[PDB]
Design a binder for these strands. Structure first.
Ligand SMILES: O=P([O-])(O)O
Length: 1095
DNA sequence: CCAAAAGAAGCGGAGCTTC
């Protein structure tokens, strides 16, 4: 334990004594950290890190010598060295600002003088930096090594933080602002997606600083300092970047939006460098020079990423051996630049790509204000995508004269729900633009004869890319549809691309040609198809055509189908057999493919079936109120309004109601993820208003093209057949909007009743500022909920099966109950330890617990089975990082601002997360994992969770293995896994130890709404034990269903497109049988097996 | 609705209070 002497020898002049017992000023930096047994950072021991790294970066020779490496990244050339020299000079500026802020802090309120006299200011939430200062005459100054190293981390963070940020969805934004996701104003999510909250910025910053300091945390040091000191430094650096304008701080006032919320939220945006800044070609020089084992870097050639030991943001969960194997397999895949697309992108240019794939140049006065904000969000995603791609290309180009020959590797990690996610924000897996320029797919085809198997594969790839639903028709039929398109509407674009793959030039109207030829088929992969077809046309040796064009073996209604196969636990029913066939599970039809099923057996997929069940359910609701004209009218107005702006809603001339599968796609999807009815109503309403806000921009653009244009023939001109026909459409719109915002349906004892809101909506509409706000959005929502979503949910349940719904409810209840106990017990164990610490003179409130004390508290929860094991995957549903456990500030900057709450890794309630976790995890998660590690695992693919991109040369075998992988995941039993964990929990849990708050939460999950109020600890305990039994029975059934189904002859083509189904070779033949007959035989096998168990 | 959480700032030196 000579560590004390060691760290003191490195920082012998820091203020205070490294002894938590000493009476005077104690130095918590020396108490909190220790030198690593093996060097982690090259700045440790350095007296002037900035000067030393600046010199290291001054020349390639000096760099190589500093990083003790014979060679250096070729991208580190002259122009780049020059940018870094300038950035280093800027680091001196940030350091100078930091030194002055400290000086100010020391002067104000005589803090420094008081600190010198013994006031323990180095323990205050805003004075932890005083732990890295040194006495200087009558004042104090930063230890230059710690300060400059932190500024270097600040520089690296400034360069690449933005590209490592997570994407914020509605849910996220709602959490931050506290505003109901359904009411989130327009563009709010965009403003918050392009920025970083305080927690977000400081957190990532503190991580970098601590890593660059290169020390290790002392397990017996208070988190208040081990985590607080690096965080305090980060807060000061963020403040310094605000002063230097490297970062813009924007305090968003929620009261301006929702006048009831008083939250004011800080948003931090890093100032972007010019897209053409040389530093973009090599933004990680500092990182790679400072750290022994750099984190941020590209992996070229044979430089492969290491394999992550723990699940993403879940340190407590280790990646299983099979998961690690999968990660290794995916990281070994070599990706390569497709020069043709890169050249095409570069020639079209950023502006035209935005015009073609974004919103082009939008002038804020020809567009609705809300619509505008949406278009701006669209442009951003594509633009950042474009710039990221070319910064990558700039670095690849330096690795060789032929960029198409430089192998690129990507790091991956397993997420909380078992998905193999490629690290980074804009990469082949996450960004469509990048996916068509950097591919792992490659094949050499013989396209000299259009009758070759190779040409057919090529056709399949082209058709799928061009939006031909290749999995719904046979290969032969798709071949004809593709030909028709290539020879017809696409011909003009094809000709242009031919010219491009000859002279390298594009017409001035390239965007119009493409846009016209593609229509709604437009996408980045569609551009790849046009490019690849045109390259083939001009190809010299069509006998050996090399192309990365791919075919995606794509899951058909994957999530829902997986849930149905994994969690249906009763006897087999004919409706289930017919419905599961829609997902590629064919019983008694050897070698049957999805292509044949859709063309000769059933043309309706699971979405269509849901939509059709919705129509039935909707019809029933109308009958129950057949006599109530007010209701009938409210329903007609809702349907009228949707048919007015949504493609999937058609109202026939004679009133015939038609709904297209599209309307059910997301609702079904998220309903399988545990979503509630209100959330679905909210999304449907948003898709309506978005169409409306856009139609307002269609109007503004109508008046500019002709001032004397009737509102009717300006808003519905293109959607009408005349001016009178447009007048009646406008009548509908105005009618519906007023009725749907002034009147809303209410649930009063099972019956629906209309009530005025008093907040009706009407008046001269201004196509410029038109907006449906709060109370009116709420009304549209209430109408959507009861007249459309309610029946939709009934339709969904009827389609996926009530048995599956029952299973998901028990799963949700079990995992929720368990998470409540984990959360509560953990907080109490913490509370007891703190009350125990308050009796310790060395300890101070604000200091928290040590990592060892936290590790102990977590270990003590093991008997409650916090982890769910499957044998190949581990799930920690309750796991999280929240501020509710410590409930205090960790640190602030020296201006008493940027107060970062102390977050701790600890269990928190699960809510409904148990459903997504287990369904995604044992479903598509396990399948991809299996696909990456199974015998003969397909090579050179790009896996995207529920679909996989395959090179045209291996489409048949890779897709058959994919279907085999699906079959393998269908042998899983997530309920059984939950059961095993829950049963251990039930035999060690003590409900009497739970706070009244926790015990009530449990009552909600385990008890009927009519038994909470007076529920005794012994009551809810017996109710919880009932769920264990429910789970055990569900799991037993699932286990039998899987065994029995495996005895029958099955053709599996869930990962459809190619027509290569996996055959399980079941011995029992169920061919020439109706679904009713098959269900009878399967149930016979079931009842038979049931006895085997009983005996 | 899962994928990662999540207010700011005076006064005083924590944590209550006001917007
Ligand atoms: O083109 P897909 O969606 O049928 O695979």
């Amino acid at each position: 334990e000579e560590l004390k002497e060691g760290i003191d020898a490195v920082y012998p002049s820091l203020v205070g004594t490294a002894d938590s017992k000493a009476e005077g000023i104690k130095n918590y930096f020396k108490l909190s950290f220790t030198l690593p047994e093996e060097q982690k950072s090259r700045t440790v021991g350095s007296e002037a890190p900035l000067k030393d790294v600046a010199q290291a970066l001054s020349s390639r020779a000096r760099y190589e010598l500093f990083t003790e490496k014979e060679t250096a990244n070729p991208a580190f050339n002259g122009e780049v060295i020059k940018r870094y020299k300038e950035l280093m000079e800027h680091g001196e500026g940030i350091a100078d600002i930091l030194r002055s802020r400290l000086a100010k802090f020391l002067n104000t309120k005589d803090v420094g003088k008081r600190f010198a006299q013994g006031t323990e200011a180095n323990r205050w939430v805003g004075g932890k930096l005083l732990n890295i200062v040194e006495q200087d005459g009558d004042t104090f100054k930063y230890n230059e090594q710690l300060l400059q190293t932190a500024v270097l981390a600040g520089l690296q963070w400034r360069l690449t933080a933005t590209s490592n940020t997570a994407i914020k969805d509605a849910k996220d934004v709602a959490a931050i602002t506290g505003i109901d996701q359904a009411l989130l104003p327009e563009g709010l999510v965009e403003q918050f997606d392009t920025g970083m909250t305080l927690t977000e910025a400081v957190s990532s910053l503190a991580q970098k600083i601590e890593s660059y300091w290169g020390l290790s945390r002392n397990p017996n040091a208070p988190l208040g300092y081990t985590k607080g000191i690096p965080t305090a430094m980060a807060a000061e650096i963020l403040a310094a970047f605000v002063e230097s304008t490297d970062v813009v701080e924007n305090i968003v006032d929620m009261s301006e939006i929702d006048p009831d919320n008083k939250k004011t939220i800080g948003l931090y945006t890093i100032t972007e460098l010019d897209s053409f800044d040389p530093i973009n070609s090599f933004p990680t020089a500092i990182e790679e020079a400072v750290l022994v084992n750099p984190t941020e870097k590209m992996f070229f050639g044979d430089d492969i990423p290491p394999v992550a030991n723990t699940q993403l943001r879940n340190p407590a969960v280790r990646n299983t051996p099979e998961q690690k194997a999968a990660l290794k397999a995916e990281q070994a895949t070599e990706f390569y630049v497709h020069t043709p697309m890169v050249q095409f992108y570069e020639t079209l240019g950023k502006d035209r790509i935005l015009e073609l794939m974004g919103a082009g140049t939008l002038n804020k006065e020809l567009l609705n204000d809300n619509h505008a904000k949406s278009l701006e969000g669209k442009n951003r995603s594509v633009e950042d995508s474009y710039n990221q791609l070319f910064s990558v290309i700039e670095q690849v180009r330096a690795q060789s004269e032929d960029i198409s020959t430089v192998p690129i590797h990507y790091a991956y990690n397993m997420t909380r729900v078992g998905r193999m996610q490629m690290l980074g924000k804009y990469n082949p897996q996450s960004a469509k633009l990048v996916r068509e320029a950097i591919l792992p797919t490659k094949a050499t085809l013989d396209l000299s004869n259009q009758n070759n198997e190779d040409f057919s594969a090529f056709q399949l790839g082209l058709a799928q890319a061009l939006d031909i639903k290749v999995h719904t028709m046979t290969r032969e039929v798709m071949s004809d549809e593709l030909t028709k398109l290539l020879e017809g509407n696409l011909k003009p674009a094809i000709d242009m691309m031919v010219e491009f793959n000859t002279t390298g030039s594009l017409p001035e109207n390239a965007v119009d040609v493409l846009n016209t030829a593609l229509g709604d088929r437009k996408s980045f992969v569609a551009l790849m198809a046009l490019m690849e077809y045109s390259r083939y046309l001009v190809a010299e040796d069509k006998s050996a055509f090399v192309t990365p064009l791919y075919v995606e073996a794509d899951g058909v209604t994957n999530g829902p189908i997986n849930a149905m196969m994994l969690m249906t636990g009763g006897l087999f029913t004919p409706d289930w057999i017919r419905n599961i066939a829609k997902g590629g599970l064919f019983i008694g039809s050897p070698n049957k493919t999805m292509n044949e099923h859709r063309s000769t057996a059933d043309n309706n997929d699971l979405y269509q079936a849901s939509t059709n069940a919705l129509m039935e359910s909707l019809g029933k609701l109308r009958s129950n109120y057949a006599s109530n004209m007010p209701i009938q009218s409210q329903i007609d107005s809702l349907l009228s309004l949707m048919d007015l702006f949504l493609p999937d809603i058609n109202l026939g001339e004679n009133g015939a109601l038609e709904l297209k599968r599209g309307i059910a796609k997301n609702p079904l999807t998220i309903t399988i993820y545990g979503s509630g009815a209100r959330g679905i109503a909210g999304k449907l309403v948003s898709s309506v208003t978005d169409a409306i806000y856009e139609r307002m921009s269609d109007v503004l653009k109508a008046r500019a093209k002709d001032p004397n244009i009737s509102a009717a023939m300006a808003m519905f001109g293109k959607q009408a057949a005349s001016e009178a026909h447009a007048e009646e459409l406008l009548a509908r719109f105005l009618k519906d909007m007023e009725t749907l915002t002034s009147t809303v349906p209410v649930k009063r004892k099972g019956v629906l009743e209309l009530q005025s809101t008093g907040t009706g909506a009407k008046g001269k509409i201004n196509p410029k500022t038109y907006t449906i706000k709060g109370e009116q959005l709420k009304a549209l929502q209430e109408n959507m909920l009861h007249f459309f979503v309610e029946p939709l949910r009934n339709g969904i349940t009827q389609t996926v099966g009530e048995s599956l719904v029952y299973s998901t409810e028990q799963l949700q209840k079990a995992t929720q109950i368990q998470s409540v106990v984990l959360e509560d017990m953990f907080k109490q164990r913490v509370q007891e330890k703190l009350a125990e610490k308050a009796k310790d003179p060395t300890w101070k409130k604000g200091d928290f617990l040590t990592q060892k004390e936290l590790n102990d508290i977590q270990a003590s929860l093991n008997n409650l089975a916090p982890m769910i094991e499957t044998g190949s995957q581990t799930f920690y549903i309750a796991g999280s990082e929240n501020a509710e456990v410590a409930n205090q500030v960790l640190a602030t900057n020296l201006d008493d601002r940027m107060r970062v709450p102390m977050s701790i890794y600890a269990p928190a309630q699960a809510g409904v997360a148990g459903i997504p976790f287990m369904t995604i995890g044992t479903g598509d998660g396990m399948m991809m994992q299996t696909l990456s590690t199974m015998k003969g695992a397909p090579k050179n693919t790009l896996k995207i969770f529920d679909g996989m991109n395959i090179g045209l040369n291996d489409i048949t075998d890779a897709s058959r293995k994919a279907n085999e992988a699906v079959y393998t995941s269908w042998q899983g039993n997530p309920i059984k896994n939950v059961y095993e964990s829950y049963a251990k929990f039930m035999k060690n849990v003590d409900f009497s130890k739970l706070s009244p708050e926790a015990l009530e939460a449990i009552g909600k999950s385990a008890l009927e709404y009519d038994q909470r109020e007076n529920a005794t600890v012994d009551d809810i305990a017996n109710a919880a034990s009932l769920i264990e039994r429910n789970l055990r029975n569900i799991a037993l059934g699932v286990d039998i269903r899987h065994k029995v189904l495996d005895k029958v002859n099955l053709s599996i083509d869930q990962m459809a497109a190619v027509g290569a189904p996996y055959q399980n070779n079941g011995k029992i033949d169920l061919s020439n049988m109706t679904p009713e007959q098959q269900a009878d035989e399967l149930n016979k096998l079931f009842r038979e097996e049931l006895e085997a168990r009983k005996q």
